[PDB]
């Protein structure tokens, strides 16, 4: 016996599958990092079916705002959808809102980048130690 979700939402231009709101309780746990979700800390959910538990079917998971971004592609979040389109965002506080906008700029062509690394640059003999045998 657990209080179920009331069937009666008011939205016209909002995405259902995607919803964001304050973590009412610290019961749920993220799967991207496998870490409990501290109460109060903003959180989001995505309507999808668990591959490990097909019996349940259409379920609702939860992932920290930071995980939602990193796994924005893996989860299946297209650029056509922004943070302002997250059920609840509008309700959230401006301060928090911007926090999500700065993370999910919506449409943007972001590409991977590479830097540099050491090749060797070995020098003449120097003072060092050595392993031991048996």
Residues at the interface with Zn ion (CB under 5 A): 30, 32-33, 64, 67
As measured in angstroms, the least distance from the Cβ of 67 to Zn ion is 4
Whether residue 109 is annotated as binding a ligand: the answer is: no
Other C-beta atoms lying within 10 Å of the C-beta of residue 43 = 23
102 marked ligand binding residue? no
The Cα–Cα gap between 73 and 103 comes to 14
DSSP β-bridge partners for residue 44 = 20, 63
Nearer Cβ to Zn ion (30/92): 30
Give the residue with the Cβ less far from Zn ion, 33 or 69.
33
Give least dist CB 24 to Zn ion, A: 17
| Closer to Zn ion by Cβ: residue 9 or 47 | 47
Binding-site residues from annotation: 30, 33, 64, 67
């Amino acid at each position: 016996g657990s209080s179920g979700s009331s069937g009666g939402s008011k939205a016209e231009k909002t995405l259902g599958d995607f919803a964001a709101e304050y973590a009412k309780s610290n019961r749920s746990t993220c799967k991207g990092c496998m870490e409990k979700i501290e109460k109060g800390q903003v959180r989001l959910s995505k309507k999808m079916v668990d591959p490990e538990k097909p019996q349940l079917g259409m379920i609702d998971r939860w992932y920290h705002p930071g995980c939602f971004v990193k796994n924005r592609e893996e989860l299946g979040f297209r650029p056509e959808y922004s943070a302002s389109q997250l059920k609840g965002f509008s309700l959230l506080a401006t301060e928090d809102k911007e926090a999500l906008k700065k993370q999910l700029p919506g449409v943007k062509s972001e590409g991977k980048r590479k830097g540099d690394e050491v090749d060797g640059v070995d020098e003449v003999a120097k003072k060092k130690s050595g392993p031991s045998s048996g």
